[PDB]
Amino acid sequence: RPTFYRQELNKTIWEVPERYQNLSPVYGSVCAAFDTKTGLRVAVKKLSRPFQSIIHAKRTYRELRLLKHMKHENVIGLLDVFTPARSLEEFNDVYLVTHLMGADLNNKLTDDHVQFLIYQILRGLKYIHSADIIHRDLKPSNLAVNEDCELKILDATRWYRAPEIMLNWMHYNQTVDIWSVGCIMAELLTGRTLFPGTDHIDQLKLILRLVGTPGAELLKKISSESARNYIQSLTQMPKMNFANVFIGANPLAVDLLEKMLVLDSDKRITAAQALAHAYFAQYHDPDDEPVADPYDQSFESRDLLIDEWKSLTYDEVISFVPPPL
Ligand SMILES: Cc1nn(-c2cccc(Cl)c2)c2c1NS(=O)(=O)c1ccccc1-2
Numbered sequence: 189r190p191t192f193y194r195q196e197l198n199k200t201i202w203e204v205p206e207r208y209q210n211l212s213p214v215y216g217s218v219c220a221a222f223d224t225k226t227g228l229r230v231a232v233k234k235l236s237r238p239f240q241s242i243i244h245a246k247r248t249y250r251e252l253r254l255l256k257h258m259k260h261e262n263v264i265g266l267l268d269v270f271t272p273a274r275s276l277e278e279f280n281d282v283y284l285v286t287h288l289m290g291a292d293l294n295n296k297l298t299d300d301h302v303q304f305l306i307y308q309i310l311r312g313l314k315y316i317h318s319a320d321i322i323h324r325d326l327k328p329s330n331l332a333v334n335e336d337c338e339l340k341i342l343d344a345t346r347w348y349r350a351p352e353i354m355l356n357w358m359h360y361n362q363t364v365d366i367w368s369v370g371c372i373m374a375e376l377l378t379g380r381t382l383f384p385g386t387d388h389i390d391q392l393k394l395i396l397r398l399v400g401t402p403g404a405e406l407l408k409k410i411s412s413e414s415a416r417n418y419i420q421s422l423t424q425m426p427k428m429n430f431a432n433v434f435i436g437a438n439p440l441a442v443d444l445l446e447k448m449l450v451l452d453s454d455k456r457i458t459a460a461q462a463l464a465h466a467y468f469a470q471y472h473d474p475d476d477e478p479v480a481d482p483y484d485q486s487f488e489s490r491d492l493l494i495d496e497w498k499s500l501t502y503d504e505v506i507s508f509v510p511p512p513l
Pocket of ligand 1: 214218231232233264284285286287288289290330332342343
């Protein structure tokens with residue numbers, strides 16, 4: 189339907205429609221560009237070798253499904269998806285289009301700013317979690333921020349992982365993301381990484397030091413004996429007073445962190461509960477914190493061939509409906 193034009197860039201090729209102009213660089217690579225149909229600055233990502241293997245093909249499929257489903261102000265939204273190919277037979281390259289944002293949280297703020305940024309992260313997690321989706325990798329690099337201070341969640345790394353991910357607990361839940369948020373918030377109030385471990389052992393040592401080693405009430409819920417010994421085989425440590433670690437920060441912020449950085453995931457506060465915490469007194473509006481439509485994750489359990497994952501992805505591309513301007 190539209191007209192495409194080839195181009196070299198990032199030591200890579202791009203055949204995009206002609207409505208996207210002025211490509212400029214910025215897993216797969218992202219480019220800045222100008223979208224003529226709406227006159228917004230957009231970001232265009234080209235997946236690298238989307239169907240090189242079964243795991244890749246499934247991930248490409250998973251990423252398109254997730255992006256096609258996200259419709260919320262604090263979560264990355266798909267503006268367009270396209271491929272140059274004319275036929276499923278010819279289909280080997282995938283590009284995704286989103287609102288360009290500029291900086292990351294990666295790039296010391298005031299308590300008012302922190303509130304607004306964490307608030308928006310929780311509003312987006314509430315949404316994402318209502319669909320049974322766990323992000324798993326929230327970090328400053330994955331939080332895009334515009335000049336207006338508006339934020340969207342997008343898709344070391346160990347520094348923000350919940351301890352039940354570090355130990356490969358097979359049955360972790362949604363509140364792994366709340367832990368990440370907890371480390372992020374801390375990093376914004378102190379300008380310092382909360383847990384800058386050097387490896388999966390150092391990392392945990394640092395966590396336990398702040399949160400204290402587990403109580404017998406938590407130890408009784410750990411199914412792995414390796415895990416258990418490894419843990420029980422460590423020098424007991426107590427919970428520190430968060431009011432003395434986060435010295436002079438808002439005592440409401442501190443309260444919120446105590447509730448996010450709990451070791452036991454079963455007692456960690458949720459996104460929806462945190463949004464009603466006092467720390468967000470001035471942003472919190474339960475009439476404007478929506479939840480998502482249900483998300484069919486049934487494919488996560490299937491074992492298909494590359495040619496099958498590739499064709500389901502093609503279908504998803506073809507059946508894309510842009511949002512309204
Ligand atoms: C990590 C990242 N940055 N990143 C990105 C990089 C710079 C600006 C913006 Cl808005 C996003 C993206 C990504 N991945 S993504 O699935 O959220 C995505 C889809 C489409 C276009 C870019 C991204």
